[PDB]
Design an enzyme around this catalytic site. Structure first.
Site, PDB file in Angstrom:
ATOM      1  N   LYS A  24      65.012  48.841  96.210  1.00  0.00           N
ATOM      2  CA  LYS A  24      64.338  47.557  96.397  1.00  0.00           C
ATOM      3  C   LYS A  24      63.554  47.136  95.154  1.00  0.00           C
ATOM      4  O   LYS A  24      63.017  47.980  94.431  1.00  0.00           O
ATOM      5  CB  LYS A  24      63.427  47.595  97.632  1.00  0.00           C
ATOM      6  N   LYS A  29      66.564  43.320  97.720  1.00  0.00           N
ATOM      7  CA  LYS A  29      67.116  44.593  98.179  1.00  0.00           C
ATOM      8  C   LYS A  29      68.536  44.778  97.652  1.00  0.00           C
ATOM      9  O   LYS A  29      69.387  43.901  97.815  1.00  0.00           O
ATOM     10  CB  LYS A  29      67.098  44.678  99.708  1.00  0.00           C
ATOM     11  N   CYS A  30      68.781  45.924  97.021  1.00  0.00           N
ATOM     12  CA  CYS A  30      70.067  46.204  96.389  1.00  0.00           C
ATOM     13  C   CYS A  30      70.969  47.079  97.253  1.00  0.00           C
ATOM     14  O   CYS A  30      70.534  48.101  97.791  1.00  0.00           O
ATOM     15  CB  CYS A  30      69.858  46.857  95.023  1.00  0.00           C
ATOM     16  N   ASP A 139      61.095  41.792  78.816  1.00  0.00           N
ATOM     17  CA  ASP A 139      60.596  42.818  79.735  1.00  0.00           C
ATOM     18  C   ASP A 139      61.389  44.123  79.628  1.00  0.00           C
ATOM     19  O   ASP A 139      61.682  44.765  80.636  1.00  0.00           O
ATOM     20  CB  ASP A 139      60.603  42.284  81.178  1.00  0.00           C
TER      21      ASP A 139
HETATM   22  C1  LIG Z   1      72.264  45.477  88.103  1.00  0.00           C
HETATM   23  C2  LIG Z   1      71.369  46.275  89.010  1.00  0.00           C
HETATM   24  N1  LIG Z   1      70.194  46.014  89.613  1.00  0.00           N
HETATM   25  N2  LIG Z   1      69.915  47.200  90.312  1.00  0.00           N
HETATM   26  C3  LIG Z   1      68.788  47.280  91.043  1.00  0.00           C
HETATM   27  C4  LIG Z   1      68.424  46.239  91.902  1.00  0.00           C
HETATM   28  C5  LIG Z   1      67.267  46.246  92.678  1.00  0.00           C
HETATM   29 CL1  LIG Z   1      66.903  44.859  93.758  1.00  0.00          CL
HETATM   30  C6  LIG Z   1      66.402  47.328  92.616  1.00  0.00           C
HETATM   31  C7  LIG Z   1      66.709  48.389  91.772  1.00  0.00           C
HETATM   32  C8  LIG Z   1      65.773  49.550  91.712  1.00  0.00           C
HETATM   33  C9  LIG Z   1      65.582  50.323  92.861  1.00  0.00           C
HETATM   34  C10 LIG Z   1      64.711  51.411  92.846  1.00  0.00           C
HETATM   35  C11 LIG Z   1      64.019  51.729  91.679  1.00  0.00           C
HETATM   36  C12 LIG Z   1      64.201  50.958  90.533  1.00  0.00           C
HETATM   37  C13 LIG Z   1      65.074  49.869  90.547  1.00  0.00           C
HETATM   38  C14 LIG Z   1      65.242  49.062  89.291  1.00  0.00           C
HETATM   39  N3  LIG Z   1      65.944  49.581  88.286  1.00  0.00           N
HETATM   40  O1  LIG Z   1      64.736  47.954  89.220  1.00  0.00           O
HETATM   41  C15 LIG Z   1      67.880  48.352  91.005  1.00  0.00           C
HETATM   42  C16 LIG Z   1      70.831  48.179  90.191  1.00  0.00           C
HETATM   43  C17 LIG Z   1      70.999  49.474  90.671  1.00  0.00           C
HETATM   44  C18 LIG Z   1      72.137  50.202  90.294  1.00  0.00           C
HETATM   45  N4  LIG Z   1      72.358  51.475  90.718  1.00  0.00           N
HETATM   46  C19 LIG Z   1      71.493  52.253  91.601  1.00  0.00           C
HETATM   47  C20 LIG Z   1      72.111  53.635  91.804  1.00  0.00           C
HETATM   48  C21 LIG Z   1      70.097  52.400  91.095  1.00  0.00           C
HETATM   49  C22 LIG Z   1      69.062  52.582  92.014  1.00  0.00           C
HETATM   50  C23 LIG Z   1      67.746  52.723  91.574  1.00  0.00           C
HETATM   51  C24 LIG Z   1      67.452  52.675  90.213  1.00  0.00           C
HETATM   52  C25 LIG Z   1      68.479  52.489  89.289  1.00  0.00           C
HETATM   53  C26 LIG Z   1      69.796  52.355  89.730  1.00  0.00           C
HETATM   54  N5  LIG Z   1      73.066  49.643  89.472  1.00  0.00           N
HETATM   55  C27 LIG Z   1      72.933  48.395  88.995  1.00  0.00           C
HETATM   56  C28 LIG Z   1      71.809  47.655  89.356  1.00  0.00           C
END
Ligand SMILES: Cc1nn(-c2cc(Cl)cc(-c3ccccc3C(N)=O)c2)c2cc(N[C@@H](C)c3ccccc3)ncc12
Length: 261
Positions: A24, A29-30, A139
């Protein structure tokens, strides 16, 4: 209000199956979404319209999309079309399964010098493409530097991005990233948020004596008080740091938990 199991758009008329939860981001929400016809996997950002009730909030998302949609580079997260139903706005993005460079940092602390070279190079090459197309990210952080199954750095999250302070703020952010990768802790890290801004304004950091003199020389210039004296993106690639020591072209998945051997 339930997010549908199948996500269809009026435009492309493609069906996306909502798979496993990924995380999230504030109001978004992803989910891992799969094209029901081609079986291609994507990272789907789902944002409710109740989060964009105000037209002002609806502007920032449409500005982010407009910038991200135009982008096409092997070091920027791929845009693959956005759409909306009455309840949610869906953004189809490239899937990065090995999370971001933040999760690697927390698990690894200070990474080895060759790793930093690999990570910075690929990041800077992506930042170069942005700056060439007159786009400032604004950012840049470890959480924005996503990693795929091949450990390739892909820049995402353009929520504060702009198109034409200027380009040199991205250089500053990259200086923090290079510091954090090599040292193991953020340059202006403190428990108090108010303190962090005083630390930034007065330019209060000190690279510990343990760091490579060549690497510390690059970090200082990237974080220099005078923004005009900061290196340009093109100057970064050719700096001694990259050309002096060993720089691998590929990194194993083991780098997520342990140093390479
Ligand atoms: C493009 C794009 N955007 N996001 C994404 C989207 C949202 Cl709404 C939230 C978050 C997010 C969730 C929790 C912590 C941090 C984040 C953050 N990086 O902002 C990440 C992606 C996520 C992924 N892979 C998954 C495995 C992943 C899960 C958590 C962290 C990294 C990658 N691959 C591509 C994207």
């Amino acid at each position: 209000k339930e997010i549908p199991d199948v996500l269809v758009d009026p435009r492309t008329m493609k069906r996306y199956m909502r798979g496993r939860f990924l995380g999230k981001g504030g109001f978004a929400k992803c989910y891992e979404i799969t094209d029901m016809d081609t079986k291609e996997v994507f990272a789907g950002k789902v944002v409710p319209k109740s989060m964009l009730l105000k037209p002002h909030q609806k502007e920032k998302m449409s500005t982010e999309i407009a910038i991200h949609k135009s982008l096409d580079n092997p070091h920027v997260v791929g845009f693959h079309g956005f759409f909306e139903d009455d309840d949610f706005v869906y953004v189809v993005l490239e899937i990065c399964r090995r999370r971001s460079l933040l999760e690697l940092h927390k698990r690894r602390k200070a990474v080895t010098e060759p790793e930093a070279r690999y990570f910075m190079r690929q990041t800077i090459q992506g930042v170069q493409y942005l700056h060439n197309n007159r786009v400032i990210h604004r950012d840049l952080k470890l959480g924005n530097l996503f990693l795929n199954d091949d450990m390739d750095v892909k820049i995402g999250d353009f929520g504060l991005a702009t198109k034409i302070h200027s380009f040199e703020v991205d250089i500053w952010s990259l200086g923090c990233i290079l510091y954090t990768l090599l040292v193991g802790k953020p340059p202006f890290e403190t428990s108090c948020l108010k303190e962090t801004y005083i630390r930034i304004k007065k330019n209060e950091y000190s690279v510990p004596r343990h760091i490579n003199p060549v690497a510390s020389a690059l970090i200082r210039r990237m974080l220099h008080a005078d923004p005009t004296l900061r290196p340009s993106v093109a100057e970064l690639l050719t700096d001694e740091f990259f050309t002096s020591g060993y720089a691998p072209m590929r990194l194993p998945t083991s780098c997520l938990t342990v140093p390479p051997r």
